[PDB]
């Protein structure tokens, strides 16, 4: 919370100290774990969505050529999901090293689906955006995991 | 979130803009409603606890003199709870005016239990602290409600 507004508010109560301690406790600047935990939630969500949509596009039928490219993405994402899950376990264990390994793996995954899908004459934007989004997110996670305190 | 750390983090990703937009969205400085909403939650919680404990002290028996002072507090708090509930409805409706009225009412309530209980030779600290705490909290709410945009 803005140190400004916080003081602008407490400096009007019959007990600034209490008010300041309360607001600071309630709206504190995020810690590294929390930043990482949020980022992984977003990536896991995004990935899950992509996997549900890839399966969909495939289930409704598509030309032999696309169906192959997409089936590729499906396999890539199933791995990605798994890696992200493990990465979450590591973040929980405070293992930034382990987390970093895992997220990198997922990032590739996302990246690979993109490749396996670029040469298509037409692609579902949903899958492309999500894959790029997931790469951006994963990038953030990688940075954060590095700042996690090591052994 | 610290504009510093935020930049310290995004300035290491292959896409600062995205990362910055993400983190800023995810960990944004609280708005007035949110500050008020949190404060009321804390006060409502605190009040409810006090009421459950006042009833308790009374249910287990106490000398005629204390039982009267406490029964007083019970009535004061039952009103306080109600006022706080209404205040919550107002905050929801964006009625800072209405909210302010209601919280003031509760503040008194808290304050009154304190009076009705000071002349006792001995008091349950739990009830005293909670009442002072609730007054501090209510104070914050009063300030905030005033900054809520008016008609």
């Amino acid at each position: 919370m803005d140190s400004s507004e916080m003081s602008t508010i407490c400096d009007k109560t019959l007990n600034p100290s209490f008010c300041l301690k309360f607001l600071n406790t309630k709206f504190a600047s995020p810690n590294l774990q929390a930043l990482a935990k949020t980022t992984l939630d977003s990536t896991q969500a995004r990935a899950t969505q992509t996997l549900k949509k890839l399966q969909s596009i495939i289930d409704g039928g598509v030309d032999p050529r696309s169906k192959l490219a997409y089936r590729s993405c499906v396999d890539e994402y199933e791995s990605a999901i798994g890696n992200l899950e493990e990465a979450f376990e590591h973040l929980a264990s405070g293992d930034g090293m382990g987390m970093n390994m895992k997220v990198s793996a997922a990032l590739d995954g996302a990246d690979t689906c993109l490749d396996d899908v670029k040469r298509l004459r037409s692609v579902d934007s949903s899958v492309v955006n999500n894959s790029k989004t997931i790469k951006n997110l994963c990038g953030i996670a990688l940075v954060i995991s590095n700042m996690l305190p090591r052994n």
Side-chain angles (χ1 to χ4, degrees), chain A residues 84-101:
Chain A
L84 256 15
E85 293 181 354
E86 255 115 53
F88 198 78
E89 306 210 348
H90 291 308
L91 177 65
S93 259
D95 181 5
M97 198 68 258
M99 185 184 144
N100 186 288
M101 293 166 77

Side-chain angles (χ1 to χ4, degrees), chain A residues 94-114:
Chain A
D95 181 5
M97 198 68 258
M99 185 184 144
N100 186 288
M101 293 166 77
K102 253 58 188 185
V103 166
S104 302
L107 192 173
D108 290 350
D111 185 66
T112 305
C113 170
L114 279 183

Side-chain angles (χ1 to χ4, degrees), chain A residues 41-61:
Chain A
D41 280 13
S42 283
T43 316
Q44 296 197 245
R46 192 70 75 174
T48 296
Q49 302 167 186
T50 306
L51 182 57
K52 285 190 180 180
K53 182 132 187 54
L54 277 168
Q55 293 292 192
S56 174
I57 301 173
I58 292 176
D59 286 354

